[PDB]
Amino acid sequence: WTATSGSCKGRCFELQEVGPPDCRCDNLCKSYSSCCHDFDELCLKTARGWECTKDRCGEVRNEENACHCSEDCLSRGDCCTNYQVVCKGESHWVDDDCEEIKVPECPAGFVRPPLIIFSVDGFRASYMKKGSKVMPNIEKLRSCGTHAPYMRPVYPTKTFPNLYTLATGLYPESHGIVGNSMYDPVFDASFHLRGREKFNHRWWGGQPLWITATKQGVRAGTFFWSVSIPHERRILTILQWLSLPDNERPSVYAFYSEQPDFSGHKYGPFGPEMTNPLREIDKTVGQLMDGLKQLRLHRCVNVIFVGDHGMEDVTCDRTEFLSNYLTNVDDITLVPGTLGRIRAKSINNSKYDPKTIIAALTCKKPDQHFKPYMKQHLPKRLHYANNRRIEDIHLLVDRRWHVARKPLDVYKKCFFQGDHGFDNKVNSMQTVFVGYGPTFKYRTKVPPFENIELYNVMCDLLGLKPAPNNGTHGSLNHLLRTNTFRPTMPDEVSRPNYPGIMYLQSEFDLGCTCDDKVENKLEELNKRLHTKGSTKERHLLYGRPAVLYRTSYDILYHTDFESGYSEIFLMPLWTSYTISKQAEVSSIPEHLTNCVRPDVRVSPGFSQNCLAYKNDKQMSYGFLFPPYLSSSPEAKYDAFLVTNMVPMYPAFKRVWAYFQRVLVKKYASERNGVNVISGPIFDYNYDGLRDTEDEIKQYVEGSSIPVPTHYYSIITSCLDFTQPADKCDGPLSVSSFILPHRPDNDESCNSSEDESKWVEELMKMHTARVRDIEHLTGLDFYRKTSRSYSEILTLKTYLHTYESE
């Protein structure tokens, strides 16, 4: 109940919201049916429209007008945005040359430059180039300020998950808004676009920018707008708020445009009907900037022009129907469209089998346009698993397609020609970023980056300390003229042991064997120098990674590789090796096929054993440094140490062997040498964070050898590829992956063929950022380079996407 009889006189778009049933005059009141009786009359005036004309100049203030052209309007803060242009001979902001903004140029009483976030729904990254002729204001912002060629949304590339990610720096799995519709079983409730449930605070986790600002005494203009307030009135309201007295004026403002997404759904991303909404968004930007220039704030405000996701071509006839695959299609609930999520219709049904449902959706048709996954098997780069609102069964849908349960669902809900929500590496889902103002750089292009990073930068822009979030703070310092945050490297928590030879061979009873008893007085000095770390500067290019948790581990040196060997997990946490452009691939000699050798530096009690692998009929083993890339027949013996061994499903060994035998060498020839760091990952609770020993759900049978859920590799080289990886003088270039350690290759529909037809496609799908691997391992990489730390942070957030241009 709202007793809606009070008045909005003097309170139009009030900043503090009053407590019901007293009537509301704030920008959200429409959406609660709670506006005072006279809200439209007082607060939503439209008389005479939005522009001054010659004859309105110096008019007598008439309060009924939507905006004013009278002499007192600058003082009252409520001129039409074009007042000076029409009535004072001024120029439009877009017609002025840009001039570098070296310092903020603000009226007296401004303590900090205001931030305005101008967010545009569905604004695909290629609109910047493709609609440039019709967006002159936006093109001025872009070329004069700081811009990226595109910005990567988060998955799913839907509206609410992306807007709330912008506001929080959090992955949808952490902020809670995991889709445009959700079911939460602990609440027992659904969240929809239609209706009232979406308004309850229980959905919205994390700490959004406006709340961060408020708690630290920076005042915030309201971010949500009600859908029926027109664009011109939002702009005017922001400009009015900017005229408030110093003690009442907010420092941060948000504007939201429903376009071009709205049209894009109807006409597709490049439909001819799309030119007009681009013109209109450009015009609104023009109104804002003319408004700022009137208030003399155009060289004082930081403006962020940012999209939530792009838009792809999608029509009704590109729909795959689950009824074409399943038989009990009625025992399921599907959240449909550009992604799929499946759960049971009824929780009082114990005859519902996730495994049978998945098997029934796997490689069923040769051209199939989706792929089922248990959520914990989705590519780790999507970070889409650690929330009760995310269903166990997920369908990743091919770009340009839809999934639906039955045909009746598609025609008893072609309407649409555009949609979004797909994998966030897809080109058509990419969106825009421009920053313009005193705190951003002048005419600067920056590399593409992820939208999870902006919350930190907005906090920097406002002098706020960010709530804990998924950005890497410092990784966008190169966007800013000043206000940079000065990050420091995390302190190493555990320091390694450096064991020497401490055990005789016969102390070991591991059930391992090797054909290695064959025999020089000169090269006995050498082998010894190699075990002391004489080649270490060649294989460890960027310092050893730092272990950021408490544990027991040993540094092991070898001719061809260095490793950090964990006495707790009985395997390396990391293995580092450099492969130059010239390096040769050889094979495993026949007498050495099943060879595993005790490491006399590490006690039997902290070693794996061959017996366990013999007894475990499911589990086999592989090596982190590959024997194929040994530098000499003698150095090959090092690769067969029991301390280089890791557990591997036979099915996974097909993937790994091909990576080690064929791909490392291909990359080394292409990149002029690579440094490679590889290792296991344990993430049994799928939270994207390293597991502690007591979280491991799986061991090699009858042993304490823990089974990795994933294997990673980081492959680094010189960005200037005329320089070899081991002698690089400037910026680095990196690509990485986190391969799921699975007992089958069901994920790859062509896995019956040669590894050369499917393995690399799989690895590309599981591309990762170094930062993703740091979270999953508790390691910190690149500790000793000649690069600045901000630069290394950018490199650690890079993702190699494998899309075209």
Ligand SMILES: *[C@@H]1O[C@H](CO)[C@@H](O[C@@H]2O[C@H](CO)[C@@H](O[C@@H]3O[C@H](CO[C@H]4O[C@H](CO)[C@@H](O)[C@H](O[C@H]5O[C@H](CO)[C@@H](O)[C@H](O)[C@@H]5O[C@H]5O[C@H](CO)[C@@H](O)[C@H](O)[C@@H]5O)[C@@H]4O)[C@@H](O)[C@H](O[C@H]4O[C@H](CO)[C@@H](O)[C@H](O)[C@@H]4O[C@H]4O[C@H](CO)[C@@H](O)[C@H](O)[C@@H]4O)[C@@H]3O)[C@H](O)[C@H]2NC(C)=O)[C@H](O)[C@H]1NC(C)=O
């Ligand atoms: C991306 O960035 C984010 C933000 O930094 C990272 O997420 C953080 O990770 C932390 C570690 O996992 C986690 O810390 C835990 O917090 C518990 C208290 O949590 C509440 O308070 C915070 C702070 O204000 C709040 O943000 C939380 O909000 C969550 O939950 C609400 C409501 O439930 C949601 O609205 C909201 O969306 C959010 O949900 C997300 O987090 C939860 C888990 O916290 C997930 O389950 C959800 O799916 C969703 O993703 C909370 O309201 C705290 O109690 C924990 O402490 C236990 O563990 C420690 C280990 O040190 C131990 O010492 C303690 O004693 C304690 O143990 C006891 O509890 C155990 C488990 O119940 C039990 O087994 C024991 O027996 C003990 O009784 C813990 O410190 C932090 O909450 C989140 N923050 C956020 C915002 O998600 C995220 O990791 C980053 N992602 C990546 C990939 O790096």
Ligand SMILES: O=C(c1cnc(OCC(F)(F)F)c(C2CC2)c1)N1C[C@@H]2CN(C(=O)c3ccc4[nH]nnc4c3)C[C@H]2C1
């Ligand atoms: O009120 C806001 C808002 C506006 N701005 C913000 O943030 C701005 C920010 F973060 F950038 F600063 C924030 C975030 C706080 C959540 C929220 N709204 C109301 C709009 C209603 N809406 C839709 O129904 C919709 C739209 C397009 C679609 N395509 N496909 N399905 C769709 C469904 C999008 C919602 C955004």
Ligand SMILES: [Ca+2]
């Ligand atoms: Ca959207």
Ligand SMILES: [Ca+2]
């Ligand atoms: Ca974990």
Ligand SMILES: [K+]
């Ligand atoms: K075995």
Ligand code: NA
């Ligand atoms: Na297969």
Ligand SMILES: [Zn+2]
């Ligand atoms: Zn949309």
